[PDB]
Amino acid sequence: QPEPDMITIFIGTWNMGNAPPPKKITSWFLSKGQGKTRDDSADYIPHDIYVIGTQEDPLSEKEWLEILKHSLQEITSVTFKTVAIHTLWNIRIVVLAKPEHENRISHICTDNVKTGIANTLGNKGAVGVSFMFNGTSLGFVNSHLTSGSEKKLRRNQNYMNILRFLALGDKKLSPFNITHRFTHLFWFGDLNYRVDLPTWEAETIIQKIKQQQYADLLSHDQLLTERREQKVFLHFEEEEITFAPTYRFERLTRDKYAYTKQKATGMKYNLPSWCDRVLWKSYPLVHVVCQSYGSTSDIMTSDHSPVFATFEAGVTSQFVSKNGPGTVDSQGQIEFLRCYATLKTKSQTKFYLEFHSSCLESFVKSQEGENEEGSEGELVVKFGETLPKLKPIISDPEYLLDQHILISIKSSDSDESYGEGCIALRLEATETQLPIYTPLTHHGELTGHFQGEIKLQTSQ
Ligand SMILES: Cc1ccc(CC(=O)NC[C@@H]2CCCO2)cc1
């Protein structure tokens, strides 16, 4: 029975509005409704992994698991296995997988982050799950960010706290946050970004939604505009939105948006918005294709509609050779030529690199680089031909060309990372000097760049 090189992943996000779900929620898991929807011919084909994020979830874990499993069994005639479930307040993540994957899944981690301080600590934050699927690391984050049209900067701060403090994946990757720890990272939830148009325009917005004309609304969506200005979700992807705003509906129909200020809303307007979103970030040159992104039309217990997204994702096998794991394969090596880091820092410490990868027995520290002043004020750290030769555990090109090297640039004075990035080994050639590049981030914000050349030697 061969190991897969692709799987499909279902991502769901639903703010349930503290109400129990209706009897039938299968449309969610079938990717049926508005937007980029799934073909009817696929309805019986189970996804490999289902990741369900809820917010304002009033159910017990047991109650929700029974609904989810019975839903999937009705669609697919498969009894899914529970990989993980984690709840913070009313924010919940459930991971289900096909039974045939039970012995492919390992290193399961869960964690949560509470956002805010005092007043603003007690219901917003995030839950997450990570695991290995054979040779591939997967991370999943469900966040419920701060509400209200005038709080986009708070949402952006919530995002930065969650990616700094959520403790998922390989703890040995100590310089790296969740935005670098996984082959594929999916981040979804009630992100709560709004369509920033004047309150007076509410009926105009409703008109536009009825005409399925979303362009003038999406051009004011706070998540798209903040992402374009590099304020949040740097280096994440989102599929184009082709479904109506998923908030704020009158319950028990989808015919009416309830936007007017009420005591129940703290006298705030809730103009129709795309609160409910799915984004992802995968390592460079790994296959990931979004195959659906949309909302349901027939699940009306909440003031939000459920959102679905599905993905094809490349996966790799748990590789064994005669040599590694448990030794190196002298027939493999990774060399770096003419490398330099460009950093936005004002500081003047020396810097060194760390190279982390599951193709190495352990991480590798470089010598300190040579600081020069760049022509436009920047710090340039030169490594020249000084970087250590990396010794992979396995030399087979079928394994090595699928790997990635994480890079941290660290201060010699504090050993703190000033920037993190990732290089793919999926090269156009072996035994050939080829340009490499990554942006560098710290706490998910841009801090610099790393560029140079690589020379990869495989057994072929
Ligand atoms: C209109 C707009 C443009 C950019 C972004 C951020 C982003 O990461 N987009 C993914 C790629 C990256 C290169 C351009 O598109 C959001 C919204």
Swiss-Prot record:
Localization terms from the record: Cytoplasm; Cell membrane; Membrane raft; Cytoplasm, Cytoskeleton
Domain of life: Eukaryota
Tissue specificity remark: Specifically expressed in immune and hematopoietic cells. Expressed in bone marrow and blood cells. Levels vary considerably within this compartment. Present in at least 74% of immature CD34+ cells, whereas within the more mature population of CD33+ cells, it is present in only 10% of cells. Present in the majority of T-cells, while it is present in a minority of B-cells (at protein level).
PTM (free text): Tyrosine phosphorylated by the members of the SRC family after exposure to a diverse array of extracellular stimuli such as cytokines, growth factors, antibodies, chemokines, integrin ligands and hypertonic and oxidative stress. Phosphorylated upon IgG receptor FCGR2B-binding.
Domain notes: The SH2 domain interacts with tyrosine phosphorylated forms of proteins such as SHC1 or PTPN11/SHP-2. It competes with that of GRB2 for binding to phosphorylated SHC1 to inhibit the Ras pathway. It is also required for tyrosine phosphorylation.
Family classification: Belongs to the inositol 1,4,5-trisphosphate 5-phosphatase family.
Subunit structure: Interacts with tyrosine phosphorylated form of SHC1. Interacts with tyrosine phosphorylated form of DOK1. Interacts with tyrosine phosphorylated form of DOK3. Interacts with tyrosine phosphorylated form of SLAMF1/CD150. Interacts with PTPN11 in response to IL-3. Interacts with receptor EPOR. Interacts with receptors MS4A2/FCER1B and FCER1G. Interacts with receptors FCGR2B and FCGR3. Interacts with receptor FCGR2A, leading to regulate gene expression during the phagocytic process. Interacts with GRB2. Interacts with PLCG1. Interacts with tyrosine kinases SRC and TEC. Interacts with c-Met/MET.
Protein role: Phosphatidylinositol (PtdIns) phosphatase that specifically hydrolyzes the 5-phosphate of phosphatidylinositol-3,4,5-trisphosphate (PtdIns(3,4,5)P3) to produce PtdIns(3,4)P2, thereby negatively regulating the PI3K (phosphoinositide 3-kinase) pathways. Able also to hydrolyzes the 5-phosphate of phosphatidylinositol-4,5-bisphosphate (PtdIns(4,5)P3) and inositol 1,3,4,5-tetrakisphosphate. Acts as a negative regulator of B-cell antigen receptor signaling.
Protein name as it appears in the record: Phosphatidylinositol 3,4,5-trisphosphate 5-phosphatase 1
Taxonomic lineage: Eukaryota, Metazoa, Chordata, Craniata, Vertebrata
Gene behind the chain: INPP5D
